[PDB]
RNA sequence: CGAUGUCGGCUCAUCACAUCCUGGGGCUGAAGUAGGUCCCAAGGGUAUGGCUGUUCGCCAUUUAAAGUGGUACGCGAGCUGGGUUUAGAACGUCGUGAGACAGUUCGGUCCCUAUCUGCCGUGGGCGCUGGAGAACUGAGGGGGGCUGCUCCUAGUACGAGAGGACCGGAGUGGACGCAUCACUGGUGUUCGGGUUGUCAUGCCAAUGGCACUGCCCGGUAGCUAAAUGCGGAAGAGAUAAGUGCUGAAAGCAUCUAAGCACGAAACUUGCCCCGAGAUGAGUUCUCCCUGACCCUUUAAGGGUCCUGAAGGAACGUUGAAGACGACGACGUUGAUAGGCCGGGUGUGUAAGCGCAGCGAUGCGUUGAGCUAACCGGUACUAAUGAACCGUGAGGCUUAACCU
RNA sequence: AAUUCCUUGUCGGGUAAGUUCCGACCUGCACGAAUGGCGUAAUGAUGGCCAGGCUGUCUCCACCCGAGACUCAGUGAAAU
RNA sequence: ACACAGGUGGUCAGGUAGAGAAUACCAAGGCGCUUGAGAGAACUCGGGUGAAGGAACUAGGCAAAAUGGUGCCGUAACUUC
RNA sequence: AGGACCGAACCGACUAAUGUUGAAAAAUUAGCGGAUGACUUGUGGCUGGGGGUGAAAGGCCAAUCAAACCGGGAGAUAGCU
């Protein structure tokens, strides 16, 4: 979400936690997670999973410790930081299932496949 | 097209059907008495000066009841002026005041801002500070270079230094007119308007649209 | 840090044109008693604007 | 003001039912997908405001898939349109974010109208 | 940078300004006049007429109340029995404020504070 | 050399254009996308990290781009002190040695209360020609000037295919700036509560002091960003590079010599702010003052008595205004501040009593008590009438309008 | 390498990225055996590096509480 | 050089909590430190609290934050045991 | 038992900040090292300047040290300012 901030990760191949190291788009932007699409190096990770410890790739972030703003004011929070891995060139998800409550922000483009592999939006 | 002289209420909340709530300031716009007009003969420019509120009659010094006593007196809290170009108003005081605001869909609001007093240069532009621990003898929030040696040998007439941030006239443009009520008096605007709650604000249709 | 020539005694006193002390010039008439005071003041007898208010 | 409160109190519904926090409630919000929409439920402790007016928020905790969503709501939104009381819980303090920030503990029931 | 506060610090921390208030308001219900500077008179209006009015009701739970300000019990029961009833027709502004003329050892604009409607 | 503090970093910048991006063009070995090169153009913008003291460089990942230089290789009376050139010590090397290295390594005091100039703010005085109270005009001056992605046009033009537009619209972001506190939050030692140790109020109970606000838990107002609104434009005018029309000198040709038409984020405006000390001191509206003499060197005044006007200042109560001045509101014909009343808020069921329990404690009274800077009211307290300053019709010359 | 100029030697590990670090090679400019060589448990306000926790160190500052700075009264310097 | 935040040997050794001559609050006793009053700007000093991130700062985790007691369980490489 | 461990008095001085015309010609604040010993401290003595003393830095010898301070040679000398 910002640089050097550990992240959760959401789906499945995607494995245990993850570093932001870049925040894409823009010139500098500074702290930046919604719906929004992060550069990645992977901390932990599992031995069944598709990707390894150490390798960059992008993800979204679906869950935000410090929110969401929805139009009437309302703010819907988590506890932690999660994302969804993301492939660098087609920036489609690497994992077939997602797990936990993602936010109606991600509903545009891939994201449609994001919430549809989610078990609550 | 002219504009209105009205008061900051303060603001609120305007809940929409579909769950919008957009921010709204609210402005009192009493109406507003045409103390003078002014055109190309007397003057080099056509414009309204007019009024608006009430004074109690014992603030109100000679001059200013004299100039409220020509074309009907009922003194108000101050003096201000509208140019005008190109249509044609009578040149009465208005019954109603937010009329003319009812069919317009964006306004510039000009207020005096909030004053923020002396103000550093961290507060005042966006200064960054500089390291709180690494050294730093007492340098922390204080600006660091102001000039380049001797080659100018002065600071130059525009330099960000400290001094008075706010208490000034100020124009927030494009503002959406969100609800305009003649029988309140009301005009509601979305968004944030300078100044505190009771300040004299200047609305005027936007220029930019 | 320092100066560099002495400052004449013409920029003193041009500094020193505002260190100037303004008087009273209008001192008020309490109306019980006659004496004078300073406005909105005790009339140093104890007098307030008609009334004795402190005994002393 | 005089002039607001006038428009916060035409704006103002009538239909909030009494919350004290530490009580589970039910909240129905409208979501909208396409050009349908539809009543969602989101149920937890509560830690409330208490009543701010036009501008009141209650804050709702859930567990839904294993960690933590904090939500609050505006009370007087149209999107809310049904809070339900469901459990009544007894806790002693107005905001419970040190009853909340650890799991596998549950506020507790009386019912002397808490 | 301070718009609307109320609160003068007097250049002191809080637990000063809250025992010096508590010394001058027991001082102000004893002598039923006292002289101090101007602030210092101004903000013991602020202090001293909220316990005037806590004592226009006798209750245990009042003077105990009135008893937690101010921590003596002659000042309690002085407020209670002599002023009280005696400010119960009164709707606030017991005290008066007399601009008085400026210290000797230092320049301050001194005032006398004294309870509005004197037995004397 | 009777001292001009040296590299790099930080903070703050300002200029040049030999332009990195965006903008406008010519040629292309320019089909389109994407390039190459050159011309014009300085308005705005022009990364974050790993390593190293490093500028630089390499690497990782962005970006529309991560420009080149000047400014004592800008900036130490602004900061640091890692590098470098003090004194300690050691290694390699040289020297018999003391010691030495355009070699390395560990450690190693960075002063200054600003007089003048220059800036950033804010006042006092006088002037502006009778004196005031306002509202303005605008000569000037400053601010702002960035841009990505997606959709439509259109899978169209083009292209064998692959791929893929110009021109023109719409939405949504990034950075930046201004304003604000309605939301979401932070703070909230001036509000409420929990609790530890101890001391005190005779003791129980209840409180209060101190221990960083003792430690915490929340939190009003205000301030605030991370929060939320808005903004950089459109349009003109004159142009640069460039493209032309007509057109001779030169029967042709020719953008040019006469004439005419386009043409960029540069320039002048348009948007925002300051602004008549703009001494070139401007304009408009309104208000107030139209009494007796005396002395006289009269390119002229001075004095006495009577009268203080419009208005201002002072004083007080003060403010979402403020270092102080200044600015704003109010001063009894009064809501200006404090108090008071009612509400709101915020804590969270006070004290006392009764009951249950052996007791800690629980339950009922009781969503109780307390509650700030908030809101709506209320003359209870304080804003006293004098008094002070500022005068008494306002120069000369000329020209018009008047008898 | 407290020793290597070339040099940020080369290879491996750590990191998304490592002129420092650790393990090696030997091409030791210019190690080397009481000017002691190599290793070594424990010890160290010792030098370098990594990680967990932790955080205003930082993104990027915001608010508050005190002492000054500001105003008033009294006293009253200094370098130059 | 000062009515100077420094230095100066020995002796006495209360209560509660505490291992304690630590530390906190108090006894006996002694003081409020020889300029005050306001106001609540920048900036400096000394602190308190911080959303989300958590060393991205920097020469360097400098500084700050953190951990911190008693009893019991349990405890690695290596070792001169 | 221990030039043992933790930690006050006591002895010291590693880091940072403040102070740098200071409260102080080296200190204050927050931490920091030793704290039964090659410890620390009172009183008195002894060592005297090409000399002393030095767990060694050219450190220290009265705020003075690659040769103390005072007086004298002495008005040293100064191709320098």
Known sequence: IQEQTMLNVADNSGARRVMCIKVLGGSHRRYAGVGDIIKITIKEAIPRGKVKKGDVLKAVVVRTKKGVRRPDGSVIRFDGNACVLLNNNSEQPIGTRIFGPVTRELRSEKFMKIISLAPEV | ?209 | AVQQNKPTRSKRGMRRSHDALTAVTSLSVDKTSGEKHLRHHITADGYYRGRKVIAK | SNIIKQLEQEQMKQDVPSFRPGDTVEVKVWVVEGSKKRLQAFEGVVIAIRNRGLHSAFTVRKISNGEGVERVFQTHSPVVDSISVKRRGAVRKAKLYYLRERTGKAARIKERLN | MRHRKSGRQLNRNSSHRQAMFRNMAGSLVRHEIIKTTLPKAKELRRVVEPLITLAKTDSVANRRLAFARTRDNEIVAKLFNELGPRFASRAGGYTRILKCGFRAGDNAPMAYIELVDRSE
């Open chain 2, 1 to 209: 097209m002219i504009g209105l002289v009205g008061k900051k209420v303060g603001m609120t909340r305007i809940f929409t059907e579909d769950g919008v709530s957009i921010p709204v300031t609210v402005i009192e716009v009493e109406a507003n008495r045409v103390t003078q007009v002014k055109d190309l003969a007397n003057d080099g420019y056509r414009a309204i000066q007019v009024t608006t509120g009430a004074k109690k009659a014992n603030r109100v010094t000679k001059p200013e009841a004299g100039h409220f006593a020509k074309a009907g007196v009922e003194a108000g809290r101050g003096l201000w002026e509208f140019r005008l170009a190109e249509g044609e108003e009578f040149t009465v005081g208005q019954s109603i005041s937010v009329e003319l605001f009812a069919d317009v869909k964006k306004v510039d609001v000009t207020g005096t801002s909030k004053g923020k007093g002396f103000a550093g240069t961290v507060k005042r532009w966006n200064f960054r500070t500089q390291d709180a621990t690494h050294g730093n003898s007492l340098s922390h929030r204080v600006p660091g270079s102001i000039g380049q040696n001797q080659t100018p040998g002065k600071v130059f007439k525009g330099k960000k230094m400290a001094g008075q941030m706010g208490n000034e006239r100020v124009t927030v443009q494009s503002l959406d007119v969100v609800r305009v009520d003649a029988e309140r008096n009301l005009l509601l605007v979305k968004g944030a308007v300078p100044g505190a709650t009771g300040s004299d604000l200047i609305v005027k249709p936007a220029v930019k649209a």
